[PDB]
Design a protein around this ligand. Structure first.
Ligand SMILES: [Cl-]
Lengths: 267, 271
C-alpha cells in the first residue's frame, strides 16, 4: 500500500511534470486506498492513474531497456543452462533472477548468475515441476526483460510437454510483459499458443480472462506462474510459483526469508 | 523525405536509450533499407525494425501523453469556437486539422492560435460536400494522439447526420499515432458506433494488414474521412472513394501532390 503510493508518484513523474496531474494521481489513489495490496486494487489504482495522465504505457522506455539488456546477455544465460549438470533447474533459476541483474555488463552478469546458481533455491521443487511438464502447460509471465529469460525455461519445458501456452498482459500495466514483449522474445515461436489475461490486470482477475485463456488455465496439467503478484492471486492446481521473495509479506506467506529464491509447487 | 525519417529514427532511439551501439544500429539498418528500396510500407518497415532493435513497444508514450493532456485542457475552448461559429461543420473540420499542429496558462494562447487559423481558412474547401456525404455510412481514419481529441468535435458534427460512424486507429503503437487507448481517452468509443484498428499498426493504411471487419467497413463506406499526410499518400490513388483528406501540407512533396502551398490547410474530397 505504501510502496504502491510511491509507485504512483514515480509513474506520474515518468509521464509528466504538471503538478496538478501528479497530485491528482496521488490524491485519487489515496481515496481508493482509504475506501478499500490486492491485485484488483492495484489494478484499479494504476488504471485510474493512467487515465488521469492520458497515457497508455508510462514504463515503455523502462521496459525497453530491460528487454535490451536481456537480449544482450541471454546467449550467456543459455551457456550456463546448457553447461550445467541440471539444465532444467538452472533454467528455473535463470527465469527467476535474470532480470534482477543491476546495470561490459556481459562479464558482470556472468558473475551475478553464477553466484545466484551457487546460492540455489531455498524451496526447490524443480524435479516435480519437470515431472508435471509432460502435460498441457500454461506459462504465466510477469515482467518485460524477464520474459527473455523465461524463454529458456520454455524451451526446457518444450522438450517434454503435450502443449505450451504462454500468457501475457492484454494491455500495458506497470512493467508487465505484453504480447509485443513476447514477440520480441520469440515466445510466439516457442509456445504453441500465446494468449492474454484480457484487459491487462496485475496478477490474474478471473472475471477479465478471455474465454480461450480461461479454458487453457482450467485444462492445464501444470501452471507456471512468475513473480509475486501471480502468486498472491493464485494461492487452479497444480501450480508452480517461481519468484524471489522481495517483501516480508510474501516471504512470510510462502515460508522463506526475504531475498530467497523459490520454485514452489502447490500440487 | 528520407532525411527527415533518418533524423526521426535517431530521435526515437534517443527517446528510449543511451546505448550508442543500439542507436547506431538503428540508424545503420535504416540506411541499408533506404538504399535497397518515403512510402508508408517503407517507413512502417523501418520503424518496426528500429523498435525491434530497441526492444521497445512505444517510445512515444510520454510524448503522446502530453499531447493528450494539452488537448484535454483546451478542448472545451475548441468546442466553444465550433458551437459559436456561423458554420460549425467547417469550423470543426479546421479544428481537427489544427489539432494536428500547435505552459500553465496556454488556454488563452491557443484561443488566439485557433482564431487565427479559422481566419486563414482552408485553401481547398470541400466541406459542404463532406457535410453532404456525411449522411451515409462514415469511416473516420484518425492520425495522431492529441489530435484525436479534436477529431471528436468533427465526429459529433458527422454524428448529427450519418447512418453510421466507424473510427479507425492503429492496432499497435507507431510513432505518435493514436491507438485504441488514445481513442478511449478521447471517448471516441462513446461517439462512434464502431471502433476498429488498421491491424498491426502501420503508418498509413496497408490493405494487406487490415482486419476483415475494418476492410469491410472501408469498402462499404459512403465516405471515408482521412486525417494527415500519411493517410493521404496511401489512399489518394483512389481505390476507396469518396474520400475526404483533412490535413496541412507540411512539406513540398505533399503540397505539390495536392496542389497547394506549404502550410496550406486542406479539406479535399476525391471521388
Ligand atoms: Cl476510479
Amino acid at each position: 500500500p505504501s510502496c504502491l503510493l510511491g509507485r504512483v508518484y514515480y509513474e506520474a513523474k515518468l509521464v509528466t511534470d504538471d503538478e496538478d496531474l501528479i497530485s491528482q494521481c496521488v490524491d485519487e489513489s489515496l481515496k481508493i486506498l482509504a475506501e478499500n495490496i490486492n491485485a484488483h486494487l492495484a489494478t484499479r489504482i494504476h488504471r485510474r492513474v493512467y487515465e488521469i495522465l492520458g497515457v497508455e504505457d508510462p514504463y515503455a522506455e523502462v521496459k525497453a531497456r530491460a528487454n535490451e539488456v536481456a537480449r544482450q546477455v541471454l546467449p550467456l544465460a543459455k551457456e550456463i543452462v546448457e553447461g550445467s549438470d541440471d539444465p532444467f533447474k538452472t533454467a528455473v533459476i535463470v527465469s527467476i533472477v535474470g532480470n534482477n541483474f543491476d546495470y561490459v555488463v556481459e562479464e558482470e552478469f556472468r558473475d551475478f548468475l553464477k553466484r545466484k546458481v551457487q546460492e540455489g533455491l531455498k524451496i526447490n521443487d524443480t524435479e516435480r515441476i519437470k515431472e508435471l511438464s509432460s502435460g498441457k502447460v500454461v506459462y504465466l509471465t510477469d515482467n518485460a526483460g524477464e520474459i527473455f529469460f523465461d524463454t529458456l525455461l520454455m524451451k526446457e519445458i518444450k522438450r517434454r510437454c503435450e502443449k505450451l501456452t504462454a500468457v501475457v498482459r492484454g494491455r500495458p500495466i506497470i512493467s508487465d510483459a505484453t504480447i509485443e514483449d513476447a514477440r520480441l522474445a520469440r515466445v510466439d515461436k516457442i509456445a504453441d499458443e500465446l494468449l492474454t489475461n484480457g484487459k491487462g490486470a496485475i496478477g490474474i482477475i478471473m472475471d477479465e480472462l478471455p474465454d480461450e485463456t480461461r479454458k487453457a488455465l482450467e485444462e492445464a496439467d501444470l501452471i507456471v506462474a512468475k513473480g509475486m503478484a501471480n502468486y498472491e492471486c493464485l494461492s487452479l492446481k497444480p501450480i508452480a510459483f517461481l519468484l524471489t521473495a522481495k517483501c516480508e509479506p510474501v516471504a512470510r506467506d510462502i515460508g522463506v526469508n526475504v531475498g530467497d529464491m523459490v520454485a514452489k509447487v502447490v500440487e
